[PDB]
Amino acid sequence: AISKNLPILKNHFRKHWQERVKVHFDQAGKKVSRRHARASKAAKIAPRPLDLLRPVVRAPTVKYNRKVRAGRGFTLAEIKAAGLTPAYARTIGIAVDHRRQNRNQEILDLNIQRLKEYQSKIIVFPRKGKAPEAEQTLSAAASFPIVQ
Amino acid sequence: VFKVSLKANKYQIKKAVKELYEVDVLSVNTLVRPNGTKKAYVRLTADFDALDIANRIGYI
Amino acid sequence: KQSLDVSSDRRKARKAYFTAPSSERRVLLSAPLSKELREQYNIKALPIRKEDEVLVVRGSKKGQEGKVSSVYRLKFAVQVDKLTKEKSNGASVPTNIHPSKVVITKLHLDKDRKALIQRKGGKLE
């Protein structure tokens, strides 16, 4: 045991690891099933996008604060200002996130405009009868990217 | 002398013999064969000849 | 191949064939139909059946023809009248023949053979 100027490897195989080995041969074939299930959503959903429209948010910490990023959902401030309800925002595919709060006017404007551009770019199908479709754009994030 | 179904009492036989052949059974003696089927040995009363009723049923 | 609901696996195919049930086997025992008949019926090949009418085309028995007693779906063969080995004792045994050799020349007609033909895309009876 031990040896020549050779660095101290810490390796963790003293337990029965060879029972719990997981090799992702699937990887390549899983992808398929994801692509295929994303498509099956898109047909099932039909005109809508696969994704709900998500807001912009500044990542936490010293390390990442400089970066901006896509958060969970939109806040009952940013929605109310953009002129709708959280109850209804959900029906039009805006991610509402109750538990985020809003202490930066220069982030809200980023979002409020983002909601205003969304409510613009989408059309809503009347519930009553006619549904004049204009294809599906599959992602919101495609059409509404998080430019820093 | 019959082969009989297992799960068949000596009453059940007497009745079936009497019912099929319109015979008066004096007395049944069953047994169970090593092969694993019952075998009745049914006696008919004085009046009924076994010999004729044997060629009546079929087996001479 | 192109679809994903079909196998280039030999090992599976052979299993299927040798284990296939009579219902399937009937199909696998198609004989082609003659150069004469094909023009009449527009049908290259039918499943071979009990009434036979058949010119053997490959083997020692090629040229010779006949009717048939029985299709041996269990040996995938079709026994044929006249086409016989003779054992040393003088008794006559039927030769086995695989149908795709054998060529049908005077089909047996039935509602269900007509219907099959009409279903397969065949003019006339």
Partner: protein, 155 residues
């Protein structure tokens, strides 16, 4: 969990592809790696995009016939034989060589048309992999390009 798939550097791979598409030119490289390309009127063999239209196999073979293959398509036909292995009983029962490779930019049935022809591996330029361009790691598969594809290599 033994290492089956082996990572390669994207860049190395490209290098190697490029370097295979070098070899697609130069007859010397192409003639060594099989290919009856003595009847052909010089290589970097591009063909019009009229072949790109082709629908049926009959017309695709008729293109190759007149272009300068057929010495290659006879190759892949005569060459077929049983494997010399147990691989016979693992779904590799027969072998046969690689014929040319029809690169193209666009598909209006080329893929379908060449499909059944026993040598011809079609392939997009978009992909154009070293598995198809330098098989057996023998540089210089005889590529039949299209006027579209061959234009698109610069891009």
């Amino acid at each position: 969990w033994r290492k089956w798939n082996v990572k390669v550097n994207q860049n190395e791979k490209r290098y190697a592809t490029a370097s295979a598409i070098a070899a697609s030119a130069v007859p010397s490289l192409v003639l060594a790696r099989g290919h009856r390309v003595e009847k052909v009127p010089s290589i970097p063999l591009v063909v019009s995009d009229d072949l790109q239209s082709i629908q049926k196999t009959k017309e695709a073979v008729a293109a190759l016939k007149a272009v300068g293959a057929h010495s290659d398509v006879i190759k892949v036909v005569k060459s077929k034989k049983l494997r010399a292995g147990k691989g016979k009983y693992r779904n590799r029962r027969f072998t046969q060589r690689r014929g040319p490779l029809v690169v193209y930019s666009e598909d209006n049935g080329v893929v379908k048309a060449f499909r059944n022809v026993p040598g011809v591996e079609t392939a997009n330029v978009a992909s154009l992999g070293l598995l198809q361009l330098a098989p057996g790691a023998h540089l210089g598969r005889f590529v039949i390009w299209t006027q579209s594809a061959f234009s698109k290599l610069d891009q």
